[PDB]
UniProtKB/Swiss-Prot annotation:
The reactive center loop (RCL) extends out from the body of the protein and directs binding to the target protease. The protease cleaves the serpin at the reactive site within the RCL, establishing a covalent linkage between the carboxyl group of the serpin reactive site and the serine hydroxyl of the protease. The resulting inactive serpin-protease complex is highly stable. Keywords: Acute phase, Blood coagulation, Endoplasmic reticulum, Extracellular matrix, Glycoprotein, Hemostasis, Phosphoprotein, Protease inhibitor, Secreted, Serine protease inhibitor, Signal. The modification Phosphoserine is found at residue 336. The gene is SERPINA1. This is Alpha-1-antitrypsin. It comes from Homo sapiens (Human).
């Protein structure tokens, strides 16, 4: 889809920002989930406020018309929220505005029947009630997986945006629980930690790429997405982070050559919690969060600004994220001895949706127990 390049540039911009902030913490976020939310918010903005957001999502407004942009997110939201989607994706957007504001019907209509998002009116005068009825909406939304999300609300708040996403994928070619063993993970060159290490001898889309100095592994999920893992050579993590591009990711997805390997991949569970006011502020999106915000598409008369914007992303990697099977296959291993390739030191990853080539997720594992 025609907005995919911009989505990919946004993914990297945000990742590089986060990888600059801290180099000692796990990173996990949805580029799609955040862009989509701020695209939607942009429908209620005008002029500088509006342009700042779309430019902050890596769109050049002197090259791409706004219709394409939105029809792009539309198309992408259509293919993500299919009824018959085997993809374990629980995504949601909460808009919370102080009651007493006369809200534009069209903005509430555009939000709901174009971006599938929830827009609520609450009394921000009571911090506990508002905070509980925000965290309660994420309780229902995530089937019960994300609780007590919003830690604090400052009194001046009039408008909060809450962006959540939970993913627990089922491998097309799963591991066997019986083969998972506790093993070392190297968090630095002299230090190890114990992790459940998943293990399978089989045929993988796995290759060492000299340009990126990295092992590159792609594994497909049920539903149509692909996990790609990059394991840098010693000292080559940052080189790896700098050299990633969309065309490269694209090139790896195009090739379905398989080779013999003994793979080690940690079973893992990670969450990234991000303050998007802070984080997107660093990428050029400040006006919509400040007193000068033109939110007249949300409300015509009264001054309004987005007080609070939160992103929470949750990921489980395991042997296969469902307890019932049915699919039976069989990979042929050749007689020759297979390389052992262990994902037992810091690595970078992405989940790419197959129809659009969109980056559903990006992240880095520095320490699986962190």
């Amino acid at each position: 889809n025609k907005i995919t390049p911009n989505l990919a540039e946004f993914a990297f911009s945000l990742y590089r920002q986060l990888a600059h902030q801290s180099n000692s913490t796990n990173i996990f976020f949805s580029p799609v989930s955040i862009a989509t939310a701020f695209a939607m918010l942009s429908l209620g903005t005008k002029a500088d406020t509006h342009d700042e957001i779309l430019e902050g999502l890596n769109f050049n407004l002197t090259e791409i018309p706004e219709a394409q942009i939105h029809e792009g997110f539309q198309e992408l939201l259509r293919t993500l929220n299919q009824p018959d989607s085997q993809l374990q994706l629980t995504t949601g957007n909460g808009l919370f505005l102080s009651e007493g504001l006369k809200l534009v019907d069209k903005f509430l209509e555009d939000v709901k029947k174009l971006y599938h998002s929830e827009a609520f009116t609450v009394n921000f005068g009571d911090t506990e009630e508002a905070k509980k009825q925000i965290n309660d909406y994420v309780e229902k939304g995530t089937q019960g997986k994300i609780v007590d999300l919003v830690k604090e609300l400052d009194r001046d708040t009039v408008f909060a945006l809450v962006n959540y996403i939970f993913f627990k994928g089922k491998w097309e070619r799963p591991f066997e629980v019986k083969d998972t063993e506790e093993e070392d993970f190297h968090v630095d060159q002299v230090t190890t930690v114990k992790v459940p290490m998943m293990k399978r001898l089989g045929m993988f889309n796995i290759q060492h790429c000299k340009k990126l100095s990295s092992w590159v592994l792609l594994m497909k999920y049920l539903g149509n997405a692909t996990a790609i893992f990059f394991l840098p050579d010693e000292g080559k993590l940052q080189h790896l982070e700098n050299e990633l591009t969309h065309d490269i990711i694209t090139k790896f997805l195009e090739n379905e050559d398989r080779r013999s390997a003994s793979l080690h991949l940690p079973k893992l569970s990670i969450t990234g919690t991000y303050d998007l006011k802070s984080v997107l502020g660093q990428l050029g999106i400040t006006k919509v969060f400040s007193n000068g915000a033109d939110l007249s598409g949300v409300t015509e008369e009264a001054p309004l600004k987005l007080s609070k914007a939160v992103h929470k992303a949750v990921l489980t990697i395991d042997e296969k994220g469902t307890e019932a099977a049915g699919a039976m296959f069989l990979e042929a291993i050749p007689m020759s001895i297979p390389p052992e390739v262990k994902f037992n030191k810091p690595f970078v990853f992405l989940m790419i949706e197959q129809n659009t080539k969109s980056p559903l997720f990006m992240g880095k594992v520095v320490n699986p127990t962190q």
